[PDB]
A paper describes a structure:
[name] ([name]) is a multi-domain bi-functional protein that belongs to the protein kinase superfamily and the doublecortin (DCX) family within the microtubule-associated protein (MAP) superfamily. [name] ([name]) is an understudied bi-functional kinase with a proven role in tumour growth and development. Multiple isoforms of [name] exist, generated by alternative splicing. Here, we report the crystal structures of [name] kinase domain in complex with [name]-IN-1 and its precursors.
Based on our initial structural information, two compounds were designed by Ferguson et al., introducing ethyl ([name]-03-055-1) and trifluoroethyl ([name]-IN-1) substituents at the R4 position 28 to improve selectivity towards [name] by targeting the deep hydrophobic back pocket surrounded by residues Leu440, Val449, Met465 and the backbone of the DFG loop. To better understand how the ethyl substitution at position R4 provided increased potency towards [name] and increased selectivity over ERK5, we solved the crystal structure of [name]-Cter:[name]-03-055-1 (residues 372-686) to 3.1 Å resolution. The backbone H-bond interactions mediated by Val468 located in the hinge region are still conserved in [name]-Cter:[name]-03-055-1. Our crystal structure reveals that the R4 ethyl group in [name]-03-055-1 indeed mediates additional contacts with Lys419, Ala417, Val404 and the gatekeeper residue Met465 as compared to the R4 methyl in XMD8-85. In addition to enhancing binding to [name], the R4 ethyl substitution also decreased off-target binding to ERK5. This could be attributed to the presence in ERK5 of a leucine instead of methionine as the gatekeeper residue (Leu137). The structures of [name]-KD in complex with the benzopyrimido-diazipinone scaffold analogues XMD8-85 and [name]-03-055-1 show a conventional type I binding mode and in both cases the glycine loop collapses allowing extensive interactions with ring B and ring D contributing to their affinity towards [name]. The key positioning of the methyl group in XMD8-85 and the ethyl group in [name]-03-055-1 at position R4 towards the gatekeeper residue, which controls the access to the back pocket within the ATP binding site, along with the difference in the nature of the gatekeeper residue between [name] (Met465) and ERK5 (Leu137) have highlighted how selectivity for [name] over ERK5  can be achieved. Binding of both XMD8-85 and [name]-03-055-1 stabilised by vdw interactions between ring A and Gly532 that precedes the DFG motif. It is likely that these interactions are contributing to the stabilisation of the activation loop in an active conformation with both the DFG motif and the αC helix adopting a typical active-in conformation stabilised by the canonical salt bridge interaction between β3 strand lysine (Lys419) and the αC helix glutamate (Glu436).
Residue numbers in the entry: 382 to 427, 430 to 475, 483 to 521, 527 to 590, 594 to 648, 658 to 670
The structure:
């Protein structure tokens, strides 16, 4: 850790240990304010999968997206001081609670889409909870849409069918991932479960089903919203605006004791 960081910040324990970065909690010495420190290891050769994610982060300012406070660039790694969300991810209850979560998620997705940004890795692990409100994070896979995209990326559970097809995709792959998440929030398991290729062939059909007994006491409005969010026809599929105008975003759920089993 370089002296430039420690002069102003006090790095602490590790709260995020992915394969692509390290996150730690830290305190600004001047103001005794908590923040998060993202440490991104650079390639041993002296670069654009890091710079791009930073270029994205300098443009995003929304109450439902983890905020970039400041950045320090160093030869071996790049240090990002970001806002700290102390609640944990989506894993860490009612249709009323879940509907507010999609509202936060769709407000972020709507904001990003106005800047032609596609997140391409929206999943529960990348959604953080303030004590509830959600905040979207990890813009490593985000990119600006200037044309159809053909790169297959993201965790296969939340990947849209047109990504699997490799025919071209765009801004509406984030609505699909949000639909899968909302589906999970209501019953605790994913719409397409598979049995590696079986999952891909299942998603490509796009048969969203609400089985019994889990989906019996969930409103038809949520079913209608989820079905419109998970439409294989991209043109028909809902936009972030269409999701936010839906009445379900504007009854206890037996969901936890099954999220721990499936994930
Ligand atoms: C650099 C900014 N940032 C992201 O960009 C970010 C984006 C996506 C995912 C994780 C991120 N990291 C790690 C972030 N994680 C958090 N918060 C957070 C999270 C988890 C925990 N625990 C750790 C201990 N185990 C046992 C329970 C959970 C504790 C946390 O805060 C105290 N606030 C901001 C993040």
């Amino acid at each position: 850790i370089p002296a430039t960081i420690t002069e102003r910040y006090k790095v602490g324990r590790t709260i995020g240990d992915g394969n692509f970065a390290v996150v730690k909690e830290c305190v600004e010495r001047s103001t005794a304010r908590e923040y998060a420190l993202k440490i991104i290891k650079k390639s041993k050769c002296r670069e654009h999968m890091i710079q791009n994610e930073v270029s994205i982060l300098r443009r995003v300012k929304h109450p439902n997206i983890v905020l970039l406070i400041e950045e320090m660039d160093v030869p071996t790694e790049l240090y990002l001081v970001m806002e700290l969300v102390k609640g944990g991810d989506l894993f860490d209850y009612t249709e009323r609670d879940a509907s507010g979560m999609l509202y936060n998620l769709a407000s972020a997705i709507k904001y990003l889409h106005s800047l032609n940004i596609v997140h391409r890795d929206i999943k529960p692990e990348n959604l953080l909870v303030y004590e509830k409100s959600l905040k979207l994070g990890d813009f490593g896979l985000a990119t600006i849409v200037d044309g159809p995209l053909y790169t297959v990326c993201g965790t296969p559970t939340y990947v849209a069918p047109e990504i699997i097809a490799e025919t071209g995709y765009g801004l509406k792959v984030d609505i699909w991932a949000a639909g899968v998440i909302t589906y999970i929030l209501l019953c605790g398991f994913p719409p397409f479960r598979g049995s590696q290729e079986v999952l891909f062939d299942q998603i490509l059909m796009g048969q969203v089903d609400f089985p019994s007994p889990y989906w019996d006491n969930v409103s038809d409005s949520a079913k209608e919203l989820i079905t419109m969010m998970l439409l294989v026809d991209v043109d028909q599929r809902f936009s972030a605006v269409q999701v936010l105008e839906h009445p379900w975003v504007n009854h206890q759920l037996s969901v936890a004791g099954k999220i721990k089993k499936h994930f």
